[PDB]
Amino acid sequence: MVNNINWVKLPVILDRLLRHPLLTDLNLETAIQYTLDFISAMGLPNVYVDKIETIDIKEYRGELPCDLISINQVRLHKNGIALRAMTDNFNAYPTHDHKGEPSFKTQGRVIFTSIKHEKVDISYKAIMLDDEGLPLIPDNPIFLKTLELYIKKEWFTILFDMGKISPAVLNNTQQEYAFKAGQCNNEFVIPSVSEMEAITNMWNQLIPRVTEFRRGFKNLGDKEYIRVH
């Protein structure tokens, strides 16, 4: 992302929506759901906050944090060795012989690892919250314009099923959302001048680096210097 993600509270989005006299019965309760339906559908990873937490595995099981949404990487606390993913169908289940590589698996508020008794560090992503327990949205007026249009798109769809909006008004709102929801995708994704140096070092390599996942993706963007002979 090129810009910085400054945080503003949710009543900024109702400065803009209630400028339209057809959307004046929007509420904070209606704006809380339509913001979270939007943030998840757009899926821009720069909207979430990066958190690191150490949890302890009891018996191939650990208790996962409350505010988690998605895990970037799990590692081991003693080695720093990262864990990949459990492809095993038969993880902690022993044969009657009562009988290699760390891996993990996450479903709910539980993590299923291939290690028995060890501490693991989990680098995850959460929603950034307010003083209130509400989501805190970015300041970028491409994001705020396309969030304004999304809430306007789902409200006008409800009026069109009732029959209180002509079909050319929804068809224009579905069109104007469709461009700004792509323009918001291109804004939050396209790398910076600082972030294109981290891709210039990864892409240009005389001797290829194919084990960055074993580290914490730390040297993914590091310059591969070559001695002169």
Partner: protein, 225 residues
Amino acid sequence: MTYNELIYMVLDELKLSSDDSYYTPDHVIFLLVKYRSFLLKQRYSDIKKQIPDSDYQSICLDLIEVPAISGEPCEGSSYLRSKNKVPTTMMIGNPRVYPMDFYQGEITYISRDRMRYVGYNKFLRNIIYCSKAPDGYLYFKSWNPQFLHLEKVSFNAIFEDAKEASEMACPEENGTICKLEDKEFPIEDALVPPLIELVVKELRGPEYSPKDEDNNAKDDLPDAR
């Protein structure tokens, strides 16, 4: 404008000026309030427009902590409800429960059919939901135990009966208004001449219809008495 000016421009257009007339002002107060709701539903239900600030009424409410059914422990959590019954809002405006300040507080008036499954989102558990029950009281709901400390709320909506919400009206700064006819009629002035013409046409025909004047233990209307 008040009720008094609207009653007495329906009456003075009908010339029901005599004390001994068959159609009283109580015929008109009924027929103005029903033809108001008829007139608002015909303009503002076809497509969505702006309702002006004048079709609304603000009523003040006092809430009491009532259980779900009775004092049993395994029947659920308790609610709040108004001490009095609440007028039925029309579904054409922006109903709004506010804690005696319109520009503050997020109390969300919702439908009665939605409220039995509500608040299950984790970012919607501190919100106070409202609906008017089949009993007629406005019920309040949250997952937050702080919401049972509400004592006074107001309610600004387009109610069906203009008479019902004029009696529960918010107290003015000078004081409460004793007579019904001295309170503001809740309709825009752009709809008053369609409102007057409908009530007058409703009662101009019956005004010249014959009455059963004879006391003869017999129906005298078939002979145009």
